[PDB]
Amino acid sequence: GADYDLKFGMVAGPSSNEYKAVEFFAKEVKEKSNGKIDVAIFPSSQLGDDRVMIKQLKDGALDFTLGESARFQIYFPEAEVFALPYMIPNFETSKKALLDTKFGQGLLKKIDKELNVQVLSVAYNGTRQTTSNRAINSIEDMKGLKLRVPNAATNLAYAKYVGAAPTPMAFSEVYLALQTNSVDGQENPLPTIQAQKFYEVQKYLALTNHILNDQLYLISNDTLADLPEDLQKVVKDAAAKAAEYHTKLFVDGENSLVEFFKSQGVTVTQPDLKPFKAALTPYYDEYLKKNGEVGKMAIEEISNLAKL
Ligand SMILES: CC(=O)N[C@H]1[C@H]([C@H](O)[C@H](O)CO)O[C@](O)(C(=O)O)C[C@@H]1O
């Protein structure tokens, strides 16, 4: 078969838009390399979660993974800006904030230099909404709600600041937790709610619109070093096409999925978001205290972009 047998790990499962785009990536790479590269895919946290996988890219033990810009906060806390709730208004602002600002370029350089990882392309992974086993009519209904979050500082802070009881748990554990009422809710973009069938086990959806997720196609520098230049170019080009498809999948899913969910019996609320935004405002201050002048710059540059 192939000269290069590469591995691509992800948290998302095999019915997800992420998996659809990663399968497209693997196909494009096999075709354009003339069969010289073959890509195996390990979804559903088969290799661990995304923190483990990012570490495996760093260590040269895994070739590819997906990760949010914001996830880099586990190494470079200033990256948290990408996840601060209600701070980034759309994908265009997120992508330009990473690629076209001095802050973002500085962060990409650190990732390459210190973590041994290159960003191949940037995709949209949806805006997070809140499912539950009780109606969320306003921020008041968050109070004491047992809200699963991923194992991520910003989602923990979101739950805390709205009044909820944050319960961190790996993605792979969520469906059972919802089904059994071990937690009262969780929070994820619409397409994820569909792919994991969380709508099967949650009677309610609230459009809290709280955190916008991007999605980085990541490659280990050890992988790039293992590939000849012309196959490096194949990989880079394929990642560019896959990200565009990935983003389209999420945009078209978001535009359609509330109606789908209603048709499956889900009750869909639209709480006033003004008090959600006000509740999180002070967490921006925590960010600024933790990250100093780099943090300040990040927020100014995003503000300027959002203004366009
Ligand atoms: C690239 C990646 O693995 N994204 C995953 C994210 C991030 O881990 C989290 O947003 C913190 O960055 O968590 C999920 O939304 C979740 O567990 O609910 C699953 C999703 O597949």
Residue numbers in the entry: 2 to 309
What does the original paper state about this entry?
The first step of this process is the transport of sialic acid to the cytoplasm, which often takes place using a tripartite ATP-independent transport system consisting of a periplasmic binding protein and a membrane transporter. In this paper, the structural characterization of periplasmic binding proteins from the pathogenic bacteria Fusobacterium nucleatum, Pasteurella multocida and Vibrio cholerae and their thermodynamic characterization are reported. The structure and the thermodynamics of the binding of sugars suggest that all of these proteins have a very well conserved binding pocket and similar binding affinities. While the C1 carboxylate has been identified as the primary binding site, a second conserved hydrogen-bonding network is involved in the initiation and stabilization of the conformational states.
Pm-SiaP and Fn-SiaP were crystallized together with Neu5Ac. Their structures were determined to 1.57 and 2.5 Å resolution, respectively. The structure of Pm-SiaP was refined to an R factor of 0.17 and a free R factor of 0.20, and that of Fn-SiaP was refined to an R factor of 0.21 and a free R factor of 0.25. Superposition of the structures of the Neu5Ac-bound forms of the proteins resulted in an r.m.s. deviation of the 301 Cα atoms of between 0.4 and 0.6 Å. All three proteins (Pm-SiaP, Fn-SiaP and Hi-SiaP) have very similar structures, distinguished by two domains on either side of a well defined pocket, within which Neu5Ac binds. In all of the Neu5Ac-bound structures, a consistent pattern was seen in how Neu5Ac interacts with four of the residues within the pocket. Similar inter­actions between these four residues and Neu5Ac exist in Hi-SiaP and Pm-SiaP, with minor differences in sequence numbering (e.g. Arg127 and Arg147 are involved in the first two interactions in Hi-SiaP), as also seen previously. There was one interaction seen in Hi-SiaP (between Asn10 and O10 of Neu5Ac) that was not evident in Fn-SiaP and Pm-SiaP. The binding affinities of Fn-SiaP and Pm-SiaP to Neu5Ac are 45.5 and 19.7 nM, respectively. Thus, it was interesting that the SiaPs of F. nucleatum and P. multocida bound both forms of SA with equal affinity, and that there was only a moderate decrease in the binding of Neu5Gc in the case of V. cholerae.
